[PDB]
């Protein structure tokens, strides 16, 4: 599900004018907002204006600096990494998000256009083929776990 959430986030960054894709991307489990927060964000126009402005800034960083600077600024401004580390069972989700970010940055340097990386991510979501780089890694090494 984290790849689909990253696809929705990239579609909201690329097209922040239509509010439907941005609303579908903000309500994901990666952001981690309640239904009251989504309702107050739909009701308050100024908070949605701030969200559209910061997503336009994310689009400017994504067009100027790349994939990983935009993703790092999004994970630092929203502080979603600390919230996923505080949530029990979210460390594996955070490592999957980081691996998806590394693969998107590795595939984004070989592509010139910005929508081409989004199409590549949607294609790799639609293609479940297993490569040596695109497999799931170990989530943690310090904490001892029962190894199946």
């Amino acid at each position: 599900l984290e790849a689909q959430e990253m696809l929705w986030l990239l579609q909201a960054v690329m097209t922040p004018e239509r509010e439907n894709t941005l609303r579908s991307a903000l309500a994901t489990s990666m952001m981690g907002l309640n239904a009251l927060d989504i309702e107050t964000l739909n009701n308050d126009e100024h908070a949605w204006d701030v969200v559209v402005e910061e997503f336009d800034g994310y689009r400017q960083i994504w067009r100027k600096r790349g994939v990983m600077p935009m993703l790092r600024a999004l994970m630092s401004a929203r502080n979603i990494a600390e919230n996923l580390l505080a949530t029990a069972g979210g460390e594996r989700r955070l490592t999957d998000i980081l691996h998806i970010s590394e693969l998107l940055q590795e595939a984004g340097t070989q592509l010139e256009s910005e929508h081409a990386l989004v199409r590549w991510l949607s294609q790799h979501i639609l293609e479940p083929d297993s490569n040596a780089s695109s497999q799931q890694m170990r989530l943690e090494s310090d904490k001892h776990l029962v190894q199946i």
Partner: protein, 713 residues
Amino acid sequence: IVMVADIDSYSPFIQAVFGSAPADRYLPYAISDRRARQSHPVLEAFISLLSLPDSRFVSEDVLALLDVPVLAARFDITEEGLRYLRQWVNESGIRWGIDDDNVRELELPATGQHTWRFGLTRMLLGYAMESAQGEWQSVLPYDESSGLIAELVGHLASLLMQLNIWRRGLAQERPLEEWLPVCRDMLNAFFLPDAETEAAMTLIEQQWQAIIAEGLGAQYGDAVPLSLLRDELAQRLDQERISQRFLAGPVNICTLMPMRSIPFKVVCLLGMNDGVYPRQLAPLGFDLMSQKPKRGDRSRRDDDRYLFLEALISAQQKLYISYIGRSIQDNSERFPSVLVQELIDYIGQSHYLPGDEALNCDESEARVKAHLTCLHTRMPFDPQNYQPGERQSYAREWLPAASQAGKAHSEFVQPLPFTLPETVPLETLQRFWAHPVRAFFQMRLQVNFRTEDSEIPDTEPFILEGLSRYQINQQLLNALVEQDDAERLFRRFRAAGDLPYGAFGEIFWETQCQEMQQLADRVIACRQPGQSMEIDLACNGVQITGWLPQVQPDGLLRWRPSLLSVAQGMQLWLEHLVYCASGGNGESRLFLRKDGEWRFPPLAAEQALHYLSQLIEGYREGMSAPLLVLPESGGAWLKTCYDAQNDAMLDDDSTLQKARTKFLQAYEGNMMVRGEGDDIWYQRLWRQLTPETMEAIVEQSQRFLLPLFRFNQ
């Protein structure tokens, strides 16, 4: 300076970690010795156009060429026109094959359908004739492209015809005196000159004329094939390197280049693990210099060892060496290179720590090699890096993540204020009781998770399964309910290419016609002509306005080519409640496949209004809080726990275990049937089905789905 063994593998990671730094942390960087990448959608499209007769003309390979703005601007195709052409090729039945002669060329039988010419004829017939008229030349028209937007079809037919001509042009082998104007004519035919893409076409012409000049300098007389020139141009286009910003002033990112040793204060080395460095280039085998070596002979291994020596000598102040020691996938030990191992061996055998002045020789060597080795953490948010001491991280973005002083993810379920309006339509109640969690998402907070549409398949449909089979069964059931000609619908579905070619489509149509005739013999056995009626109800101060289609005097008659499911039973029960509340004494019947039937007897006005008020209370409860009523799994749990003989629910442990088994079977299915839990609306609420939420779903299904199985017969 930072030197890597391979620049192209590490340069995305280097650019990623150097761009992500904030303004107080950002240092300027300059990457040199990388492969010169100027314009990918020009050079790659020209390489794909040089492989035009060898290509299979798949629809994705042509839409990737139309993704290029140069080829789209040549044939006057915009981005909106490309977005229309995507769904037009996806729905028009265009998979592979430009022409029927191309299908006969590949030693394949001429099917006549599922080609580019078939789709072009289909789109032009749809521009001329509506789809309700029928076939003309065993080609069903395409009713989407009808207005001036089908002019873009006239652009696409302007493209593929050109894609035929060079397909007949680049097949024959030509000598080198004839390949001169070919690339120029291809460039002025398929591409348009622009301000950005002028230098790419100039480089294409320069490399092509340089290849032909190097060929004709030897006066080559024989013929030269197309694939050789294509491979030579693909090799020559990627040969270029860039080294302009090697010493501009930002920190240098480059690979190790031989016979270049410059003194620097800080020299960093990356990718010094085994296998990556030293770069090994195997000899040709038939070279005589490798057999009898001389003094002046040069090999890449000795050049890399001398480069490591020059990097050791050229470092003035600080030398940094980093290699991958542990695998990121399986945590396997990755050994370093032999040069770094000899370096740490000479360090351990030549120096000792003042803590253990005289302990041993091997133990002091291992202690020095362990003191120099800084085994960093696997993840950047680890608290070991932020511990104060010798080494400390400068990444302030992962400091609250490593401090573990953040709030956790709260639950998505929250009590929201919601006032029930006066006029609530029947369509809103049908969309609510079709999927309650989706109706809580896409209507209350207006969050509809829009997944991307499916891509075009690479081959013609040999089998029928999924949405296409359901649409074929739906049209066949709507045709057989009026006793229409099934053969006309067979010719209509075969003219559109939705059926398999030849006899297999006939076998599929025969077995689907047998199944739909078996269903129609039960459907029209008790069918009466009925018209649509109006619904105007007042329940609990709530107005319900709507329309019920095909209301017969026997009652309600619905037919769908699906399986026995609880959602269709809930829909039929809602229609029966909204039908019996305003007159209408009679049963309600729904006929599914495999002798599945939902029946509800007629009820009084009081019981119908009470159950309608219960459904209205469930609707106003589902908008404030997410109403966890699973139709399939909750209905399976209920029908495992319900007893229709005594009209009471059992409470023994065996039924409580079989209902849990049915709930786990219907929630998460097998590896062949998609379960109910595999959905984008249920994974947002919970990640794992907890028994507390399972008991909540069980209680909500016992509260709501109980008149479904109570009045079932």
